Amino acid sequence: ATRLDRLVTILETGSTRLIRDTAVNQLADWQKQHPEELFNLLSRVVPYLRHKDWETRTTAAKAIGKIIENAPLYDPNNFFRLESLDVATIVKYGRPLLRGGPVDYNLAALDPQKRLAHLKKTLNGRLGLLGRVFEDEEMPGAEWPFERLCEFLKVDLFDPQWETRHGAAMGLREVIRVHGAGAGRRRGKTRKENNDLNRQWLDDLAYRLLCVLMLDKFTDYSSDTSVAPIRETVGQTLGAVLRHISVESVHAIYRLLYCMVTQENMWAVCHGGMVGLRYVVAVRKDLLLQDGDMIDGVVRCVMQGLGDIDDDVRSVSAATLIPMAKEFVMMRRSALDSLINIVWESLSNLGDDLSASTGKIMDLLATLCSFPEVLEAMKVSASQDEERSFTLLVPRLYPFLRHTITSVRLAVLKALMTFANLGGETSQGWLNGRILRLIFQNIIVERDQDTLNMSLELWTTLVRRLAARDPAILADEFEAHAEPMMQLALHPIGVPRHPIPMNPALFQKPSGGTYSTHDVDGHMIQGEVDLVGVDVLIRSRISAAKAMGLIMSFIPTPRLASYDTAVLQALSSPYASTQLAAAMVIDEYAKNCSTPEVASRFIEPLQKIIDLERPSHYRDLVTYVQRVRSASQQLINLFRDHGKVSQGKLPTLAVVVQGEPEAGPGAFSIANAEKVVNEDFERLKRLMAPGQRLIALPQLNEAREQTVEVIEEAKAAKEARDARIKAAAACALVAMKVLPKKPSPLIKAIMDSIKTEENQELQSRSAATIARLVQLFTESGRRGPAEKVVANLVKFSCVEVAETPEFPIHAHKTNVILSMQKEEDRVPDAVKYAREAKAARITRRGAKEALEILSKNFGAELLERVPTLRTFMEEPLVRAFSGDLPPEARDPENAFGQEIVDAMSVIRTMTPTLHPALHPFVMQQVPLVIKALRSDLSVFRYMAAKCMATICSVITVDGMTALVEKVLPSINNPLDLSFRQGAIEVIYHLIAVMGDAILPYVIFLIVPVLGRMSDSDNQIRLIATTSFATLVKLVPLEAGIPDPPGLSEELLKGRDRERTFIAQLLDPKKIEPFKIPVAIKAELRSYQQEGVNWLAFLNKYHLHGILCDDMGLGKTLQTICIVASDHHQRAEEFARTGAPEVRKLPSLIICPPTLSGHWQQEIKTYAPFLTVTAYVGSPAERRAMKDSLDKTDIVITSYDVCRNDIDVIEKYNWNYCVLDQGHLIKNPKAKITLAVKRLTSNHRLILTGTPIQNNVLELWSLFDFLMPGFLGAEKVFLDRFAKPIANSRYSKASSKEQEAGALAIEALHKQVLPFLLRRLKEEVPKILQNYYCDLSDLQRKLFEDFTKREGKKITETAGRDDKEAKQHIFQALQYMRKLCNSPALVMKPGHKAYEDTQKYLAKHGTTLEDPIHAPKLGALRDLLVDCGIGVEDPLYTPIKPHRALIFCQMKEMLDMVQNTVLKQMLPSVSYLRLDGSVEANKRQDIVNKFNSDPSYDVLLLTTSVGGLGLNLTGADTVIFVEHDWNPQKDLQAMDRAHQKKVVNVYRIITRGTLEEKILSLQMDTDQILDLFNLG
């Protein structure tokens, strides 16, 4: 179908959210550009409000919201009375609205308005306005635009089908939200007349809305989100009406809602009334706060609802009071004390498993407990009554600890925190072992990190407040729960596809019994490693050990005998997960003791783990070993079936594997499988015939390597467990200050974790340990092992090649910028190259954090306590950059080169976390790094730029001052290439390190960056252009940019040339006017001169952009202005300075071959002082001017002759280079695209009506011609922009991939926006215009042949005024006016020159119907592509801005226009044709489709049918191909067949013919005779 039908149908079948939301923005954009198509888009999304699917109704209601926002508000300068509403009659006599099964077919087939007129009679009865229950056998721009629509919605509010009532309520919500004020008004009345007419209409809707709250009994028990889907929604619609009605109408709605709550019960009427009151306080809280009578009644309603039996009534009641919980506490402290215990009463009846709706009750209690006033009034009631003591109330919060909503579980821990920080007299009846167990259970099973943090923070205060009383009391309350809680802290963790479930009987409910929108903690209690991340289970054992470690540090040691037996037993457990957790509990116990000697009884069991050998198997890794046996067996079974080997020679594998329970010492192990692939694969290969081996060995080698894959997979899995347990035991020893005599094995255990540990929390613990171990050694001599540890950390922070280059690999590179290589090289993908690179990133991550923690432990004493660090960072730079570079530093075999690289690698690794007292040491090294930026070796310049950028981001005062004073001023220097490459590179890495923090410092960066895009070195141009693109992306468009804090006041003074640039770049309306210095013959409009200001701004700062002005605004003139002015201005400065950058060079204008004459004509008209060469013609003609093109000011060239003669055109240098329809360059691989990019030009422009289509790669190719590096190379552009965009558009894409693809669209549009000048023709009388085209060779031949015969008699019959003489002259003019359109109109069989013409067409090898002989056909496709109509899915393609009418006089011409232009040339255009041949009945059909479906681009028709009174509205442009002798007969048929917008009228006229002469003349004999002369 059409675009609009396919675009709307996506609302139903949008597979992802991104695909559905993209369709609603297309419809919203379609309304924004074509505001008159409002009721064509709405009449297709409104039917989707009755859809049987929930999301389709939601999406369709969303589109109505977006489409209506793009409609102008309506200011024109049978109703219901809200007061006369009786609650008793409607509830009693009304129609209960239920889930609707019945469908009455007799009504369904009625006229859509007769169906509506019938439902408006039945409505008064169904509402109960009669004294009886109504039964359906009694009855078997002048005004508001949406008033006809709202009748269908207000009537469908009571349809038996609950799906229809759902969509009708959402539709009314979106219409009244944007357009609520104008409803009801009618043109022809004063403000006071339709202000109350609006009040009556809004009261009429509120009347109907309250009825739905009373009558709707529908309830969906399936989902826990919404219980009353219609009452929840129709109350949301009531909120949109409240923000538009008077204060008196609100107080009337308030009383009617008050009767529904305090019914003077019934669940539905009480709930629906509360829902309405919920939005009254959330929308009109201002009006509610003066009238104290409303404040009392709305609070009386909440309190009754808060004590109601049903849970859903208490939820909406609590959600009503939250927005004014602060406001109600202050104003009425008398009612404050009664509100507290009623809220507390609501939580008392609840069990442990709470519905998702009950979460709003907790939100109400949490906001009340955040006020000190409420906390005091509770203590007064606690000292007075026993039933309000904290022992009976607080445990009512425990069922909320494991609530389904994530935000509720955090609000409870924050609330329970408030009670622990309240009093000692107050909070001890509830603070016991019962709450300690629930919190410890919360630590094991909580998945959210913020909630797990508060659980540990509450566990600390709960333990410390209870240990302050007596350490024996704390140990008694927890002794009853200590035994099972230990089994959960030491519980093993499984492998993906091998979950180790926890015993659910070890979890006590708040009810007291054990476990034996639900299943909140079952995924983790089951231990699903795939469903919940492997790192989430690990950080739940870490949190367990940290909790269990703190509680043990307070219990007296003699009563910890049961705890030690559990952990000593766990150190020898067959589960590696348990041994790791066991050693971590000992660690956190020794950390929290006052002295480390208290825990010194664990020294011997832990030193066993370090010194003894590790077990060769673990029970948690049994799945890996079982997987190894399968591969080993299939490898052997293949040695039997595929290769013919006897069963007796085959080895036998054990059926049970090691680590399994009840596994003998002869079970299957990894060592057995290593013997199968290493020694039995060889032994069994000797037992094959040399003929059998040749056929079977292919598939055997494949089976062998698949086995080794799993073998090395299991061995790596076990060695990871050996390192985890050894490192955890060593860290606990370091906590007990265990400094061995021979510390090599202790240090190795901690180091092996820092090298290889995928998990960050386990690695960060080992980094913090090795940082304290360095401090413990330097605090007691032992500088031997202390300086070897720090030296390894420094070595490990340089292994990631992405951060620290390998010097011998790049040692030979000079005059190269490695920053460009690093990104143009990572776009390599091999499994064993990405695994080794992953190990390097892990090793650096650990070592970097160890030095970070080391720098914070020693503070400002880091360089005095650890003097080896100062040597690594300072010594190599002093040797190499104090004076001349030693020749040793250039050799890749010498280690000196890498020592210099590592030195600067450590500086940027530790500068951020360095104590501010060590910044002078870094500043001492700055003169050495600047010396490296100037170096000739590129790898030194690369690291110097990364290092300096980091230093400037930390020491923002002196670091920036050094860069602006010592580096930036010498980017101009044309003698030292190496310093320029280094200085632009430190700018590149400065923007990358700081990010959007670079904003205040962009002042100092902008001029060196801009000027470097105009540099002789190609690499500096590219990296400066990429830098400039990142700046445009990172600026705040709407806000200003502050000044650099703390810098010199004299640095910011002389930099005002750089502030006017940034101001003009953000806002294009602040561009300085440009007085054209050449004598141009033109009246420049407000926008034309404004557009020339934009082109001069680009020329001034060496920028390039696209001129996207809509057709008619005159893009050709604005370009001739700027190129004539530029040639003049650079003719003056070349006379002043003679610099090569302003030498005389010709400009180049590339256009489609049809527009070659159009440019040549308008330069002749507006700028007659510019000499023009037209390098277009036959290959023979082009070769004369081929060698002489620089001898003029402008050179015009077609895209076709630019490919064949590119070797000629690139031999020249060009000033300007304009592309008249530049979208032909969008193909990056096209030959025309590559030829245009081989040109050396100074200033570039692109002229298009459409800048981009659906693809983003089209946009890259255009911007790659303008500013080469602006979007990067093609491969780096396909990565950051094209890959995520294409992935989010996948039918089944991830929710992360959707936002990754949406952030890229938004970022790509921001980089390219300041370089596209897109001014609409309409927003900021119909315009006639002439489109000129040139005659063809055949037309000139046929005109000359006519005047040779007929021209003799034309002189006779010209001024006769005779009878048949005026008939001969007229039909002689008809022959010419037909020939001006197409030669095929006049060259028909029977003509005297037919046989001669066919010879001419044959000698040149063409046909008569060839479109090149009728230039009006070619001029029509160019006029259509300049209006965005024709281009060379409805979803991703943009909305076309115009629709056209195309008029012709003859039916034969329309066939050419149809079969040639719209079928061969522009096949993507949707069109309809209208002839007098078509039936007068069928022609009315397609005229309707043109006004009902706005996706018809063009309507072809002849001027005969246009005068038939048919009226069209969607037309925006009108084109005339053929013309009548009376030029107003064309004006009649146009207006007769046709306002808000402006209409563009185009006359296609061949220059030099009678068309240019007839249309000019507004008859004398000699003036008639001149119609037969060309020119």
Residue numbers in the entry: 2 to 78, 108 to 170, 308 to 431, 438 to 689, 728 to 1038, 1041 to 1537, 1543 to 1650, 1656 to 1761, ...
What does the paper say about this structure?
We determined the structure of this construct (residues 1–1836, Mot1∆C) harboring a point mutation in the Walker B motif (E1434Q) by Se-SAD to 3.2 Å. The construct covers the entire Mot1NTD and Mot1CTD domains but lacks 50 amino acids from the C-terminus. The CtMot1 enzyme is a ring-shaped protein. The tip of subdomain 1B interacts with HR1, thus lobe 1 effectively closes the ring structure of CtMot1. Lobe 2 binds the cleft between lobe 1 and HR1/2. Indeed, comparison of CtMot1CTD to other SF2 enzymes shows that lobe 2 is flipped ~180° from an ‘active’ conformation in which the ATPase and DNA-binding motifs would be properly aligned, that is lobe 1’s motifs I-III are properly situated in the ATP-binding cleft, while lobe 2’s motifs IV-VI are situated on the outside and are fully solvent-exposed. The bridge was almost entirely omitted from our crystallization construct and the only included residues (1822 –1836) together with the C-terminal expression tag are not visible in the electron density maps.
The single subunit remodeler Mot1 (Modifier of transcription 1) is a Swi2/Snf2 enzyme that either activates or represses transcription in a context-dependent manner by dissociating TATA box-binding protein (TBP) and Negative Cofactor 2 (NC2) from promoter DNA. Mot1 is an essential Swi2/Snf2 enzyme in yeast and the Mot1-TBP-NC2 regulatory axis is highly conserved in eukaryotes.
